[PDB]
Design a protein around this nucleic acid. Structure first.
Length: 430
RNA sequence: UCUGUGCUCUGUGCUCUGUUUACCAGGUCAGGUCCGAAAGGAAGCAGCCAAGGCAGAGACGCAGAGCAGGCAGA
């Protein structure tokens, strides 16, 4: 699909194709996009519908004047992409009360356990709250184990029972535990050996109605895709509050149909998480995905951080002395850094997004990030004062930083200006 | 002249306190770097610590000098 999200700007071409008509720009794209889908799993029965509705509109509308059609088209395209997928209902993944019951019903494994992590993981790096997890699966091996890891490796205990093949108890057991300790949120992955899905649920049956869980979720890898539909489906009935997510994004190639099918049941998602890494999990809201043409955008996010910074120096001392008396030192510069990789200086989103308003070049984003660490290299390879008078960088005083930071000269001189010029231009206020 | 008396001045030794110090043989060395397939190692800037610089104080140490009722002994 991704490479369709290009058809996007591939479309932002006044030139147009051969057809004098350029009239076809659309339909192609349609089909084009239309293609990229099913090819990427995606069911089709539906499609007709979309592709249709799409059409429908046309012969019943026009872009309010004062606005190039081409564009409009989209709003519409986009428009229906939404509906096409998780139409619109903003999933409510946060606290109804506290603490909580995360019944994690999983078909055969696959994200089975994993998932939980970032999930939990996620919420700890969110509310003073107290997670808590439990190995709610005894058929397949590495219950705790593989999982167990993270648990600590994230600063989040968990609990289970070696070997010990029997949910319920253990579950129950767990539960009240944290509870007794009065934690805030529990996550507990489960499943069963029944070769039939009704048997799966059949299991969750007791599982559920024995515990009395508030929030319940199933999950699946796009591996299965549109097929999945059913699976989940049968259950939306079991429990409508039944919301879910799709294991592995970067973990397939089919996707679509997966999430597609879902939707088309009134299905309820909340996240998705590209795959590996303790954080790849993400919230979810059609648009969000799709954001940026067919799915993920931010920065708006990464964007909004400016506000974080820009308006925080405000935050040394906002004044912390109304004025001007010279009260701080310009090494933010490097200050920027930290934040950022400390937390969120991950690529912030710096992608750039649509080259807009001016499309400039490939290395600009494209070529420093991955590697805007370097700049850092030094800095900490220098006294405070240094960065306050970034104009006392004699060949002498620095080569040491050069080596002291481990970087053969060049790199530096070859930067010193990306500092004294930044401003230069930067500082160009009338 | 020496010594005591104490007091003062000056130098300094030690201590306490404040402050100050990119690199130019201290310690610990984040980050980054280097060697190694790894196991493991190494050099090392910033910071901090030590140390140095500048000061105040010690009716604190060690000294030189001066001291109406300066006063004493030799």
């Amino acid at each position: 699909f991704d490479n369709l999200t290009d058809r996007l700007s591939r479309t932002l071409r006044n030139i147009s194709g051969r057809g004098r008509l350029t009239e076809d720009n659309v339909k192609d794209t349609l089909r084009e996009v239309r293609m990229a889908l099913l090819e990427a799993d995606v069911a089709l029965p539906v499609v007709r519908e979309f592709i249709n509705r799409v059409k429908e509109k046309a012969v019943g509308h026009e872009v309010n004047k004062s606005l190039t059609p081409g564009q409009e088209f989209v709003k519409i395209v986009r428009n229906e992409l939404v509906a096409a997928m998780g139409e619109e209902n903003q999933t409510l993944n946060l606290a109804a009360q506290p603490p909580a019951v995360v019944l994690m019903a999983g078909l055969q494994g696959a994200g089975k356990t994993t998932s939980v992590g970032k999930l939990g993981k996620f919420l700890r790096e969110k509310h003073k709250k107290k997670v808590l997890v439990v190995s709610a699966d005894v058929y397949r091996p590495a219950a705790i184990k593989q999982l167990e890891t993270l648990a600590e490796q994230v600063g989040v205990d968990f609990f289970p029972s070696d070997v010990g093949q029997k949910p319920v108890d253990i579950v129950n057991a767990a539960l009240k535990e944290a509870k007794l300790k009065f934690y805030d949120v529990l996550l507990v992955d489960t499943a069963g050996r029944l070769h039939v899905d009704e048997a799966m649920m059949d299991e969750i049956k007791q599982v559920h109605a024995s515990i009395n869980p508030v929030e319940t979720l199933f999950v699946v890898d796009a591996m299965t895709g549109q097929d999945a539909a059913n699976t989940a489906k049968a259950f939306n009935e079991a429990l409508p509050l039944t919301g879910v997510v799709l294991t592995k994004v970067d973990g397939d190639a089919r996707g679509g149909a997966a999430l597609s099918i879902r939707h088309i049941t009134g299905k309820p998602i909340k996240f998705l998480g590209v795959g590996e890494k303790t954080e790849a999990l993400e919230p979810f809201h059609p648009d969000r995905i799709a954001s940026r043409i067919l799915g993920m955008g931010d920065v708006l996010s990464l964007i909004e951080d400016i506000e974080s910074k820009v308006d925080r120096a405000q935050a040394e001392k906002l004044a912390s002395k109304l004025k001007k008396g010279d009260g701080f030192d310009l090494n933010d510069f490097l200050e920027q850094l930290r934040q950022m990789k400390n937390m969120g200086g991950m690529a912030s989103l710096m992608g750039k997004l649509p080259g807009m308003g001016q499309i400039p070049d490939n290395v600009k984003s494209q070529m420093d990030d991955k590697v805007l660490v370097r700049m850092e290299a030094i800095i900490n390879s220098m006294t405070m004062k240094e960065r306050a008078k970034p104009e006392i960088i004699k060949g002498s005083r620095k080569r040491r930083i050069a080596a002291g930071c481990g970087m053969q000269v060049q790199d530096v001189n070859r930067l010193l200006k990306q500092f004294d010029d930044m401003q230069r231009m930067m500082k160009k206020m009338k």
